[PDB]
Structures are given as C-alpha cells and as structure tokens.
Amino acid sequence: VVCREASHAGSWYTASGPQLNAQLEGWLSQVQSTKRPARAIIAPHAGYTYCGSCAAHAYKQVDPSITRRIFILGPSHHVPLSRCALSSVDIYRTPLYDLRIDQKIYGELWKTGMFERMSLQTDEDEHSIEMHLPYTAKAMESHKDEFTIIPVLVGALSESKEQEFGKLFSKYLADPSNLFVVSSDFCHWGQRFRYSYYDESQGEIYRSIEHLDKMGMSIIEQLDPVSFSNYLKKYHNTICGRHPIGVLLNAITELQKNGMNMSFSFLNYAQSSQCRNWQDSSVSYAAGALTVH
C-alpha cells in the first residue's frame, strides 16, 4: 500500500475539498504576515471547528516560495512509543491534494537507526500529524509540485532522547528550504483530563489557565529546553506536544551554539471555551513561528 488515507477527514475536519479550501482561506485571510519566512511553527491539532482560526496565525507565516520540505512532528496518543516512528507509505492523502514523503530525507533518517517504522494501521489511527496536512497543502498551493513532507511521530521521549533527536534534526533545521511543524495543543483543563490546577491569584479559572499557558509559552520564546522541562516538572501542564516541543527547543539551542540567531514568537492564543467552575473543561491552543536571522 502506497497511500495513507485521510482517516480523520469527515470527523475532525471537512471531507469536502472545495469546502475545506474555502474554510482555510477564510482563516488565513484574517491573519497578517509578520514572521515570514517561518523556519518552524507550533500549531494546535484539535478539530478545525475549534482551533482552525488559531492555527492560521502560524501557517500564514510560511512562505510558499522558500519552503521546500516540511517536517511534521506530532505526538502519539494511541501507541506506546519510547522514541520516534516514520511512515511506511509514500503518500499522505488529503481532500485538497495528496502529499509526497521526501524519500531522500526518509532514507537518511532511517539509517540513523533511531526510529521505528509505524505500521499502516498505527499511522492512519493517529491524528496529530494528519491535522496539519490540509493546512500545509493550502499554504503551499502556489508551489504544489515543488515540496515534500517528512512525517515524524514523536513518542514519550526521555530527556536524553529529546536532546538526541534535537541534535539530529538540527542539521535539517539549519537549511532554509526546510520547515518544522511542531504539533501540540496547550492546557487540557478539567476533571475529565484529571488536571485542575488553579492559581487563584490569577482571577477566574480561565484566567489562571491563560497565565499557566502564557508562562509555558514565554519559556518557549526564550528558546530554553531545560527551563521548559522544569516548567513541566513544576506544574505538569497538560501539553500534548511537550515532546516534539522538547525536540524543537534542543534543535534550536544546538544551532545557537553555532552563532545562528533566532526568535520564536507566539502570535495567537485561544481557548475552546471559558472555564468558570470545577465541572467546566477546555483545551487551549497557541500558534507561533520560529524565525531565523
């Protein structure tokens, strides 16, 4: 089998290409380009009905004319995985148009021997990578034929593996033709997630959540992996993509060590809804871009 089906199309996002294309254009048109050409972005992976307008702030900073290879690093929700896995197929399907996996980088990557191969069922089961495909398809439209994708599923990485993979991906982060989409939601608050940390000096629960998130967001903007790790250790904020983000940050520090100048900026912050009591629950979404200098 050569193709990964768009297995979450219909439920997490619209199956109709025309419709989906119009939706993503609405969202993209409301955002002003400020950070082109994004070398990395952090973006949510909730269903588009909730996080669509937020992610568009990140994707608008992608410059179609510069970017040639898109790496998408998403966490695994479903399988136990103590490292990273790559896809076993050649093509990722989307309602807009289908996307090609860069065979060359996929070869170099595989030869490191640091990766498992994701079975087709695993691959299709997972949504954290899929949710970026329509958005990177749309952002790249103009140069439809000239870009490949590098799907990477990031597991429950230990601190050393965040460092190791970060080191590895850093040689690719350094190429101006490349782009890391780092996939993550922010705070999952509520009983249903077993996380109801509430700092009451912050105001209402939703304001506490905002502070909690913006704190973790500020640390990412400092491009500081250790500090972020310590933030996770202190508050255990329920950040889905806390490992892809770890890999990103380590890759970023690796390049700082060679005189490269970068800023990360978060551009938008949203919440599914606004929690006010203990039986309320919400998921947070932030979108940001890394820029190289």
Short mmCIF file of C-alpha atoms in Angstrom, two decimals:
data_model
loop_
_atom_site.label_atom_id
_atom_site.label_comp_id
_atom_site.label_asym_id
_atom_site.label_seq_id
_atom_site.Cartn_x
_atom_site.Cartn_y
_atom_site.Cartn_z
CA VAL A 1 0.00 0.00 0.00
CA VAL A 2 1.37 3.37 -1.16
CA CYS A 3 -1.21 5.72 0.41
CA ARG A 4 -2.18 6.83 3.91
CA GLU A 5 -5.88 7.57 3.75
CA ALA A 6 -7.17 10.79 5.30
CA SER A 7 -8.74 8.67 8.03
CA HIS A 8 -9.98 11.57 10.14
CA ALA A 9 -11.46 13.55 7.26
CA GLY A 10 -15.20 13.91 7.82
CA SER A 11 -14.97 14.00 11.61
CA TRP A 12 -12.06 16.21 12.75
CA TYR A 13 -12.24 18.39 9.63
CA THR A 14 -14.40 18.70 6.46
CA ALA A 15 -14.14 15.90 3.91
CA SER A 16 -15.21 18.18 1.02
CA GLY A 17 -12.08 19.66 -0.62
CA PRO A 18 -13.86 22.72 -2.04
CA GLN A 19 -15.40 23.43 1.43
CA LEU A 20 -12.18 22.84 3.32
CA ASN A 21 -10.22 25.00 0.90
CA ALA A 22 -12.70 27.87 1.44
CA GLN A 23 -12.58 27.47 5.24
CA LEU A 24 -8.75 27.60 5.41
CA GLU A 25 -8.75 30.64 3.09
CA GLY A 26 -11.18 32.45 5.43
CA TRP A 27 -8.91 31.75 8.38
CA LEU A 28 -5.71 32.62 6.51
CA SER A 29 -7.14 35.89 5.12
CA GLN A 30 -7.81 37.24 8.62
CA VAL A 31 -4.12 36.92 9.55
CA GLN A 32 -1.39 39.42 8.64
CA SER A 33 2.02 38.05 7.61
CA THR A 34 4.52 39.22 10.25
CA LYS A 35 7.04 36.40 10.55
CA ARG A 36 7.90 35.18 7.00
CA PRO A 37 9.73 33.02 6.25
CA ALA A 38 8.89 30.75 9.20
CA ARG A 39 11.54 28.06 9.77
CA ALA A 40 9.35 26.34 12.36
CA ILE A 41 5.79 26.72 13.62
CA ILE A 42 3.93 25.43 16.67
CA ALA A 43 0.29 24.75 15.93
CA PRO A 44 -2.74 23.01 17.51
CA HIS A 45 -4.14 19.65 16.42
CA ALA A 46 -7.69 19.90 17.75
CA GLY A 47 -10.54 19.66 15.20
CA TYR A 48 -10.67 22.65 12.85
CA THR A 49 -14.04 23.77 14.18
CA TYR A 50 -12.26 24.68 17.45
CA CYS A 51 -8.67 25.54 16.60
CA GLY A 52 -8.79 26.46 12.91
CA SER A 53 -8.55 30.26 13.26
CA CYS A 54 -5.70 29.94 15.68
CA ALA A 55 -3.51 27.63 13.54
CA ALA A 56 -3.92 30.03 10.59
CA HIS A 57 -1.84 32.57 12.50
CA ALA A 58 1.06 30.09 12.36
CA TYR A 59 0.53 28.90 8.78
CA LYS A 60 0.32 32.45 7.38
CA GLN A 61 3.99 32.85 8.27
CA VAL A 62 5.02 30.01 5.95
CA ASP A 63 6.49 31.38 2.72
CA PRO A 64 5.48 29.09 -0.16
CA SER A 65 8.37 30.35 -2.33
CA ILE A 66 11.15 29.45 0.13
CA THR A 67 9.94 26.26 1.85
CA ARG A 68 10.54 23.00 0.02
CA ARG A 69 10.48 20.29 2.69
CA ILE A 70 8.02 20.25 5.56
CA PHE A 71 8.78 18.14 8.62
CA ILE A 72 5.70 17.50 10.75
CA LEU A 73 6.39 16.22 14.25
CA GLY A 74 3.26 15.06 16.07
CA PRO A 75 2.89 13.24 19.38
CA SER A 76 1.39 9.76 19.58
CA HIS A 77 -1.84 9.43 21.56
CA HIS A 78 -2.54 5.81 20.80
CA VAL A 79 0.56 3.54 20.87
CA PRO A 80 3.35 3.15 23.47
CA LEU A 81 6.45 4.66 21.86
CA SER A 82 9.70 5.45 23.62
CA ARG A 83 11.27 7.02 20.51
CA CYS A 84 10.11 8.28 17.08
CA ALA A 85 8.47 6.45 14.19
CA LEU A 86 8.33 7.13 10.46
CA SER A 87 5.61 6.25 7.99
CA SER A 88 5.79 3.07 5.88
CA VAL A 89 3.93 4.64 2.95
CA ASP A 90 4.86 7.06 0.14
CA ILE A 91 1.84 9.39 0.06
CA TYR A 92 -0.38 11.16 2.60
CA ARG A 93 -3.79 11.80 1.11
CA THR A 94 -5.81 14.99 1.69
CA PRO A 95 -9.14 16.35 0.38
CA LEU A 96 -7.22 19.24 -1.22
CA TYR A 97 -4.48 17.23 -2.90
CA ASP A 98 -2.13 14.43 -1.84
CA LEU A 99 1.31 15.00 -0.33
CA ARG A 100 4.61 13.25 -1.07
CA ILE A 101 7.01 11.93 1.56
CA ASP A 102 10.61 13.02 0.78
CA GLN A 103 12.28 9.65 0.12
CA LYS A 104 15.84 11.00 0.47
CA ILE A 105 15.50 12.50 3.96
CA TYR A 106 13.37 9.49 4.91
CA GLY A 107 16.38 7.36 3.92
CA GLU A 108 18.96 9.43 5.83
CA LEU A 109 16.64 9.43 8.84
CA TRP A 110 16.09 5.67 8.77
CA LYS A 111 19.82 5.00 8.54
CA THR A 112 20.40 6.76 11.89
CA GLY A 113 18.71 3.69 13.41
CA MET A 114 16.94 5.97 15.91
CA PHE A 115 13.46 5.33 14.51
CA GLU A 116 10.79 2.62 14.45
CA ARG A 117 8.54 2.06 11.46
CA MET A 118 4.91 2.97 12.05
CA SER A 119 2.55 0.24 10.74
CA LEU A 120 -0.15 1.49 8.34
CA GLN A 121 -2.94 0.97 10.93
CA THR A 122 -0.96 2.97 13.56
CA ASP A 123 -0.27 5.70 11.01
CA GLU A 124 -3.93 6.04 9.97
CA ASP A 125 -5.14 5.73 13.55
CA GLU A 126 -3.09 8.76 14.67
CA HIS A 127 -4.44 12.31 14.06
CA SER A 128 -1.72 14.55 15.48
CA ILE A 129 0.15 14.61 12.17
CA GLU A 130 -2.91 14.39 9.91
CA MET A 131 -4.35 17.67 11.15
CA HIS A 132 -1.56 19.66 9.56
CA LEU A 133 -1.84 18.23 6.13
CA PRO A 134 -4.71 20.26 4.80
CA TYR A 135 -3.11 23.32 6.22
CA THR A 136 0.31 22.69 4.71
CA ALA A 137 -1.37 21.70 1.47
CA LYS A 138 -3.21 25.03 1.45
CA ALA A 139 -0.21 27.14 2.46
CA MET A 140 1.84 25.56 -0.37
CA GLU A 141 -0.83 25.56 -3.11
CA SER A 142 1.15 28.03 -5.25
CA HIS A 143 4.10 25.58 -5.36
CA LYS A 144 2.00 22.39 -5.23
CA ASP A 145 4.57 20.38 -7.20
CA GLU A 146 7.76 21.51 -5.55
CA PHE A 147 7.51 20.35 -1.91
CA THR A 148 7.80 17.12 0.05
CA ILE A 149 6.79 16.19 3.63
CA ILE A 150 8.61 14.37 6.43
CA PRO A 151 6.10 12.85 8.87
CA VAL A 152 7.62 12.03 12.24
CA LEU A 153 5.65 10.59 15.16
CA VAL A 154 7.24 11.56 18.44
CA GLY A 155 6.73 9.27 21.43
CA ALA A 156 7.14 9.55 25.18
CA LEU A 157 10.75 10.76 24.83
CA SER A 158 13.05 10.82 27.84
CA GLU A 159 15.05 13.99 28.42
CA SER A 160 18.12 12.40 26.69
CA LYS A 161 16.08 11.46 23.62
CA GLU A 162 14.76 14.99 23.40
CA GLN A 163 18.42 16.04 23.35
CA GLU A 164 19.48 13.30 20.91
CA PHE A 165 16.67 13.80 18.39
CA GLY A 166 17.05 17.54 18.76
CA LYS A 167 20.72 17.32 17.85
CA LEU A 168 19.78 15.15 14.84
CA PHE A 169 17.00 17.32 13.46
CA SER A 170 19.14 20.44 13.92
CA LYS A 171 21.15 19.85 10.72
CA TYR A 172 17.80 19.96 8.90
CA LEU A 173 16.55 22.98 10.90
CA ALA A 174 19.57 24.85 9.55
CA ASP A 175 18.52 24.52 5.86
CA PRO A 176 16.42 27.48 4.62
CA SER A 177 14.42 25.10 2.39
CA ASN A 178 13.09 23.32 5.49
CA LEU A 179 10.19 23.80 7.89
CA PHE A 180 9.34 22.06 11.15
CA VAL A 181 5.66 21.95 12.03
CA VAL A 182 5.67 21.11 15.71
CA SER A 183 2.23 19.80 16.65
CA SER A 184 0.66 20.49 20.05
CA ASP A 185 -2.39 21.68 21.95
CA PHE A 186 -1.84 23.55 25.20
CA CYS A 187 -3.68 23.17 28.53
CA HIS A 188 -6.29 20.39 28.78
CA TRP A 189 -8.18 21.59 31.86
CA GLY A 190 -10.81 19.75 33.83
CA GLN A 191 -11.80 16.66 35.79
CA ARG A 192 -12.23 14.71 32.54
CA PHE A 193 -8.46 15.19 31.98
CA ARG A 194 -7.55 14.76 35.68
CA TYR A 195 -5.96 18.20 35.65
CA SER A 196 -7.47 21.05 37.61
CA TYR A 197 -4.53 23.10 38.81
CA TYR A 198 -5.92 26.53 39.71
CA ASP A 199 -3.88 29.58 40.73
CA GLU A 200 -6.45 31.78 42.40
CA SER A 201 -4.39 34.99 42.43
CA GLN A 202 -4.90 34.88 38.65
CA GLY A 203 -8.63 35.58 38.70
CA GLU A 204 -11.13 33.15 37.27
CA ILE A 205 -10.18 29.60 36.24
CA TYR A 206 -9.91 30.60 32.58
CA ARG A 207 -7.54 33.43 33.51
CA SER A 208 -5.48 31.01 35.60
CA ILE A 209 -5.33 28.71 32.59
CA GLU A 210 -4.21 31.61 30.44
CA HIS A 211 -1.44 32.56 32.85
CA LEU A 212 -0.38 28.90 33.10
CA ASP A 213 -0.19 28.60 29.33
CA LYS A 214 1.40 32.00 28.65
CA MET A 215 4.07 31.07 31.19
CA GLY A 216 4.98 27.96 29.21
CA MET A 217 4.67 29.98 26.02
CA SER A 218 7.07 32.61 27.31
CA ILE A 219 9.66 29.92 28.09
CA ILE A 220 9.43 28.54 24.55
CA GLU A 221 10.09 32.13 23.36
CA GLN A 222 13.30 32.03 25.43
CA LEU A 223 14.35 29.05 23.30
CA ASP A 224 15.32 27.25 26.51
CA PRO A 225 14.75 23.45 26.71
CA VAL A 226 15.95 22.97 30.31
CA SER A 227 13.74 25.75 31.57
CA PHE A 228 10.72 24.28 29.69
CA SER A 229 11.47 20.81 31.10
CA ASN A 230 11.48 22.40 34.57
CA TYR A 231 8.21 24.14 33.91
CA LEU A 232 6.67 20.77 33.02
CA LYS A 233 8.10 19.26 36.19
CA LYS A 234 6.62 22.04 38.33
CA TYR A 235 3.04 22.39 37.06
CA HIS A 236 2.55 19.31 34.85
CA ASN A 237 0.57 21.43 32.43
CA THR A 238 -1.24 19.08 30.08
CA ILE A 239 0.62 19.98 26.89
CA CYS A 240 0.05 17.27 24.29
CA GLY A 241 3.12 18.03 22.23
CA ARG A 242 5.51 18.55 25.11
CA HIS A 243 7.99 16.13 23.46
CA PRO A 244 8.02 17.45 19.89
CA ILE A 245 8.44 20.89 21.52
CA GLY A 246 11.39 19.49 23.51
CA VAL A 247 12.98 18.18 20.31
CA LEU A 248 12.43 21.60 18.65
CA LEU A 249 13.97 23.54 21.54
CA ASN A 250 17.03 21.27 21.68
CA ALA A 251 17.48 21.63 17.94
CA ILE A 252 17.21 25.39 18.43
CA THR A 253 19.92 25.52 21.16
CA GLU A 254 22.16 23.30 19.05
CA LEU A 255 22.11 25.95 16.35
CA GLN A 256 22.52 28.84 18.80
CA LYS A 257 25.84 27.15 19.69
CA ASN A 258 26.95 27.81 16.07
CA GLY A 259 26.18 31.53 16.07
CA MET A 260 22.74 31.39 14.46
CA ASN A 261 20.22 34.00 15.67
CA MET A 262 16.57 33.11 16.10
CA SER A 263 13.45 34.42 17.69
CA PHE A 264 10.30 32.46 18.38
CA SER A 265 7.06 34.40 18.72
CA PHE A 266 3.60 33.13 19.63
CA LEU A 267 1.05 35.00 17.51
CA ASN A 268 -2.30 33.87 18.82
CA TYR A 269 -3.90 32.22 21.82
CA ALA A 270 -7.33 30.68 22.09
CA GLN A 271 -9.44 28.54 24.40
CA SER A 272 -12.13 26.03 23.36
CA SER A 273 -14.43 27.69 25.90
CA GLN A 274 -14.04 29.68 29.15
CA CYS A 275 -13.98 27.61 32.36
CA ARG A 276 -15.62 29.14 35.41
CA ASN A 277 -16.47 26.22 37.75
CA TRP A 278 -14.93 22.86 38.66
CA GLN A 279 -17.28 20.99 36.25
CA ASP A 280 -16.25 23.13 33.28
CA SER A 281 -13.48 21.93 30.92
CA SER A 282 -11.49 23.37 28.00
CA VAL A 283 -8.45 22.88 25.73
CA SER A 284 -6.05 25.72 24.88
CA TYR A 285 -4.46 26.48 21.51
CA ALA A 286 -1.47 28.64 20.74
CA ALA A 287 0.16 29.31 17.35
CA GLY A 288 3.68 30.62 16.87
CA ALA A 289 6.57 30.82 14.41
CA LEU A 290 10.34 30.50 14.66
CA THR A 291 12.33 32.91 12.53
CA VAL A 292 15.96 32.71 11.54
CA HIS A 293 18.43 35.53 11.23
#
